[PDB]
Design a protein around this nucleic acid. Structure first.
Lengths: 228, 143, 247, 60, 63
RNA sequence: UUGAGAGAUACAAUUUGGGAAGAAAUUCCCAGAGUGUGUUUCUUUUGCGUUUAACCUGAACAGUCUCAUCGUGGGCAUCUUGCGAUUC
């Protein structure tokens, strides 16, 4: 009744049924996080909403080289409520793991409850701005996702670039223009940001605006290249 | 007051069904899609096909870009006339629901102002010169 | 050419026959196969001629019938230079029902040539007019939107007029002709005068009429033919049928 | 003629070709970015100097 | 070669027919935008056939 | 009817790159790109004329008493035929 279609990236499936949908192979079946539904074909499959998940806005926004895969290790700076990060745990499946970090304590309790259920997420509940307090427990991540509304994204991501990035690695930042500056134009603020990362050794590749989901958010996909 | 209650109840009903619709739905994206490179000759020589190594329609699709090597509907019953009909049916249902919601909230607001027009204070009737009828209360704090 | 020979036969028999001189028009009657849908009211819908005109507003005597007060109607239509010489007489409905009774109505029919009334009073018009005008279908009054302005729901209607627009509307309805929609298969339509133009004008007339009535578009007026047109007979009111175009 | 070759100076100088839906601009040179402080803001400096030499004071 | 591209093209046909639409997707564009954002009368219907669709030539011309 | 620039274009011709038929020369699917005039949208400049403009604010509806609401009756069907809205 519903058929699947695999995506460019692993773990990502487009479900062609009564309506097309973005779905991921579940880790554990019959258990909800934020009241989403399900679909099976037996294999159990979990939706994302491109509204409530920014990376979901990326995948159906279309990004060529996302540096996620099953058997790897990803960093997630900004996992409030744990939704997209539990979903990223889903897409890296059993073998890979994610290190999520967070600072505000209400999504702190929410994410640590999802950590009680799901194993592949390992949570760090600190302010991101001093990475010594988690270089005691994290070692040599592969890829990095950064959705933090603070304006010094370049400083904090360059800090985690010098500390944990795998060489020739993959990094994805999200940018909210109406949070960093809130007066001027989107591509302008974006060019300034990627100038910052270029001076901070991160070689970008592409960026993309999330128009019919978000209000002037974009995402920048780049690499860490010959750098320490 | 009971009338305002009933209309409010049906308005929330339609709102929640619209939200469950928007949650179960799926749209398509169209944003600024930039790509960096290092040479201006290689830039002028860039071709999306010769970068993604996919087909015509796979290039032109953005929500799904699988390479040809990764490519390496029959159960779906009449996709020419039926499944597009059902997609359009779901989206038209959601549009209908939104329009219904707007109508309901309009009637609820008019009824709510009329219900507040009955309590207390000193009222004053103005005609907004576009042709609107409305009120304005005197500067008078109630006890 | 068989059509043209038959038309020659009709006009020469019209010359010889004593009764046939005393009626002076030509009607094309069509028999199709199927019965038509819309019920027969008495709103004569118009049909255009493309190459050949028929009649002139500066040639016929005209009656206009108004809304009630008719004051600005009469004075403006009388005084403003595009309709000063056009209408023989303007009159309102209430004034008409007061003024003419019985034999006076018949005298009206004997005297005036073509009648047009406002659209907003056509629906009531034949009741004061009776059925002496409504014998058959010749002198059926038309309907004309006077002010070029449309009444929306829940808004007071604006009164105005323009001699410009009404003169164009009369020149259209007097240049080209009109038919009546029925339910039964057979129908009739007046086409042309025996002296005002000639046989090629009549054949071109018939071609444009059957083309406009066969065309699928313009549906409120021109999509009147359902099924196939079997045959066309040319006849006067008192002549006989001449058959053309039988298949 | 030479007007269109002025525009082709713009053509050889420009850095953005659109390919329908997509768009490609390239990375500015390291020595430029490192050994120049970046360019000024036309709109802001124009605004401030317009506010200085407005017509409301009869300068000149 | 042509065969490899043929297997590819078969796959492309499958994907294309699953996904694509023409004017239906345009109607969907209408619905999606609005979701993510002639002489008649009101009371007299006999007028709209009974009228005369007047001609601008029959207006501007003076016979 | 002072300049500059950016974008959407319509048509006219021009032209890159993948698939597909091609003995071949050539042709068809697609994603395009530039040029000519025309249709503009917006940013900006230049001169000339001008010093207010617009909205609010206090004791700002009301003895020809005002206003809300429910009801009763009448015209307007030659039409404001009246929406849980306000026909008069």
């Amino acid at each position: 009744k519903v058929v699947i279609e695999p995506h460019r990236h692993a773990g990502v499936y487009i479900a062609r049924g009564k309506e097309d949908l973005l779905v991921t192979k579940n880790m554990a079946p019959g258990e909800s996080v934020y009241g989403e539904k399900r679909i099976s074909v037996k294999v159990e499959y979990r939706v994302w909403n491109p509204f409530r998940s920014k990376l979901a806005a990326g995948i159906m926004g279309g990004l060529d080289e996302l540096f996620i895969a099953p058997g790897k290790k990803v960093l997630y700076l900004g996992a409030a409520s744990g939704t997209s990060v539990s979903h990223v745990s889903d897409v890296v499946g059993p073998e890979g793991v994610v290190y999520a970090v967070e600072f505000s304590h209400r999504p702190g309790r929410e994410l640590i409850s999802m950590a009680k259920k799901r194993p592949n997420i390992i949570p760090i509940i600190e302010d991101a701005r001093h990475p010594q307090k988690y270089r005691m427990l994290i070692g040599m991540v592969d890829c990095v996702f950064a959705d933090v509304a603070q304006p010094d994204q370049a400083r904090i991501i360059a800090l985690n670039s010098h500390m944990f990035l795998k060489d020739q690695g993959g990094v994805v930042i999200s940018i909210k223009a109406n949070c960093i500056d809130s007066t001027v134009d989107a591509e302008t603020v974006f060019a300034r940001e990627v100038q910052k990362l270029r001076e901070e050794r991160i070689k970008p590749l592409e960026q993309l605006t999330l128009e019919p989901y978000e209000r002037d958010h974009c995402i920048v996909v780049g690499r860490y290249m010959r750098s320490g | 007051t009971q009338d305002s209650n009933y209309v409010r109840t049906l308005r929330q009903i339609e709102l929640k069904k619209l939200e469950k619709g928007a949650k179960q739905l799926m749209f398509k994206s169209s944003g600024n899609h930039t790509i960096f490179v290092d040479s201006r000759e290689k830039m002028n020589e860039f071709t999306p096909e010769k970068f993604f190594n996919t087909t015509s329609e796979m290039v032109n699709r953005s929500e799904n870009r699988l390479t040809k090597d990764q490519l390496a509907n029959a159960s779906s019953i009449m996709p020419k006339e039926s499944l597009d009909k059902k997609k359009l049916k779901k989206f038209k249902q959601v549009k209908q629901h939104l329009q219904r919601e707007t109508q309901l909230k309009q009637v609820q607001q008019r009824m709510d102002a009329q219900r507040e027009l009955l309590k207390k204070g000193s009222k004053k009737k103005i005609v907004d010169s576009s042709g609107k009828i409305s009120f304005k209360w005197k500067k008078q704090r109630k006890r | 050419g068989l059509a043209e020979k038959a038309l020659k036969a009709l006009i020469l028999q019209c010359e010889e026959n004593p009764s046939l001189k005393n009626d002076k028009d030509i009607h094309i009657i069509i028999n199709t196969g199927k019965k038509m849908g819309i019920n027969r009211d008495n709103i004569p819908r118009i049909i255009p001629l493309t190459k050949y005109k028929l009649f002139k507003p500066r040639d016929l005597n005209i009656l206009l019938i108004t809304k009630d007060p008719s004051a600005l109607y009469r004075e403006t239509l009388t005084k403003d230079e595009h309709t000063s010489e056009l209408f023989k007489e303007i009159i309102s409905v209430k004034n008409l029902r007061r003024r003419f009774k019985g034999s006076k109505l018949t005298q009206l029919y004997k005297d005036f040539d073509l009648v047009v009334a406002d659209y907003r009073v056509h629906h009531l018009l034949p009741e004061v007019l009776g059925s002496r005008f409504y014998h058959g279908s010749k002198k059926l009054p038309y309907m004309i939107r006077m002010s070029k302005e449309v009444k929306l729901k829940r808004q007071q209607m604006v009164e105005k007029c323009d001699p410009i627009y009404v003169r164009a509307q009369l020149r259209s309805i007097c240049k080209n002709t009109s038919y009546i929609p029925n339910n039964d298969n057979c129908l009739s339509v007046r086409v042309g005068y025996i002296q005002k133009h000639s046989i090629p004008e009549i054949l071109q007339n018939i071609q444009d009429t059957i083309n406009f009535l066969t065309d699928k578009s313009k549906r409120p007026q021109g999509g009147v033919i359902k099924g196939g047109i079997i045959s066309i007979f040319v006849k006067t009111s008192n002549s006989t049928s001449l058959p053309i175009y039988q298949f | 003629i030479k007007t269109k070759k002025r525009k082709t100076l713009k053509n050889l100088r420009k850095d953005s070709v659109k390919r329908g839906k997509f768009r490609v601009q390239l990375l500015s040179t390291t020595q430029d970015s490192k050994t120049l402080p970046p360019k000024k803001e036309s709109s802001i400096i124009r605004s401030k100097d317009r506010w200085l030499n407005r017509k409301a004071l009869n300068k000149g | 070669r042509k065969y490899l591209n043929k297997l590819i093209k078969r796959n492309s046909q499958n994907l294309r027919s699953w996904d694509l639409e023409e004017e239906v997707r345009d109607e969907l564009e209408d619905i999606q935008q609005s979701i993510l954002k002639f002489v008649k009368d009101h009371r007299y219907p006999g007028l709209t056939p009974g009228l005369a669709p007047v001609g601008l030539s029959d207006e501007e011309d003076s016979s």
